[model samples]
Target: SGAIYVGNYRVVNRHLATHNDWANLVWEDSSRDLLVSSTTAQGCDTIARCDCQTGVYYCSSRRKHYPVSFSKPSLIFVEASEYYPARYQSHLMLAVGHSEPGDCGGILRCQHGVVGIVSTGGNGLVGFADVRDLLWLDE
Candidate 1:
């Protein structure tokens, strides 16, 4: 994922090549008004956003749950669609970026709204499986 509400982007370059760090990058850029910008340079197959207790990271798509009349699930990185037929639109155009030896010359590879998890018409009710620190699906 990328920045949510920041404005403007400033690319920073680094020559650190034990692994060229910037080659695989993800972050946000913003301005005083909070209108965010900048490519998020997401560079992980698994996004671990915290450093709390324990456990490994990189859980699969959390939407592997069955559908309910109350729960209309969509795949990860869903882009602008309604919750259901005749339902309101919830726009979500996102993607994941992974690393490979020659993948994009060490850059992350992603095709917006095209590359990511799978499934639909259902949702995971965390209670059915589990939860953690409000961080649903933290491995």
Candidate 2:
């Protein structure tokens, strides 16, 4: 379908050290799919995860930084309760930049299902996007 421009945080010089934890895989159920994509400062590794059913994107960083330690890898997903008034599907994408200390994983529940781990790092940029027909599940 159509594309929605989500986060637009520019990577400045001082923030260059900060990595973008973009997910890599996109998961979905039987009827829908979500596509996850991102761009980082040169030399930064970006990964993204998307849930097809609810149309959500989860992203994280794979590059290493100094003095700052990344939390245990986790998966990011989206959660929506009531339907939105907008014509487009109401896909709620929740992004938890960094969780508490020691807790290295995040959760994404879509339409009453646990999408999976959302992230596995400390301080970084994570995002989500709701697309159409971008994912599929094997029988």
Candidate 3:
């Protein structure tokens, strides 16, 4: 959905300075009942495929769900991984109370719009891999 400049010399870093934190997200959470609340969006298909019936904030590794809230965008650092070696500058950090290892790869939605997907988290803060990064792989 966007463009990037890849050159022989230095790659243009303009893409880093642009992008919004509160993006397309679809969310669903419950209380005592299985059906708690559901916020659906149109462009959610562009983000992640999540079945709200089970759990959108799903942890495949743990097979659990964690509660989280949206926060203002902030710049954070992310180490390299098997996917990409370049250092990642995170822009979204979810306000979560109960999150641990295996919570990564969960879908994070805001106001029925896909904001970002869980990348890493601790007790109160959670980092996400920008959805745009997923699109980059399309090329």
Top candidate on lDDT is 3
lDDT of 2 at 125: 35
Ten contiguous residues minimizing lDDT sum, candidate 2: 8-17
Question: Candidate 3: how large is its RMSD?
Answer: 15.0
Tens digits of per-residue lDDT, candidate 3, 26-117, equal: 11111100011112322213333332211135555556656555554456555554433445454445465455545554555543334455
Candidate 3 wrong stretches, greater than 4 Å: 1-44, 47-56, 78-88, 132-139
Candidate 3 accuracy as lDDT: 0.38
Model 1: per-residue Cα lDDT over 48-125, one tens digit each: 233222121112332122221112212233223322233222211112222221111111112221111111222321
lDDT of 2 by residue, 54-79 (tens): 32223223222112212222233323
Listed per model in order, the count of residue pairs whose N, CA or C atoms clash below 3 Å is 11, 26, 4
Error of 2 at 38 (Å): 36
lDDT of candidate 2 vs native? Answer: 0.27
Candidate 2: where is the Cα deviation over 4 Å? 1-96, 124-139
| Model 3: per-residue Cα lDDT at residue 10 | 12
- Give the backbone clash total of model 1: 11
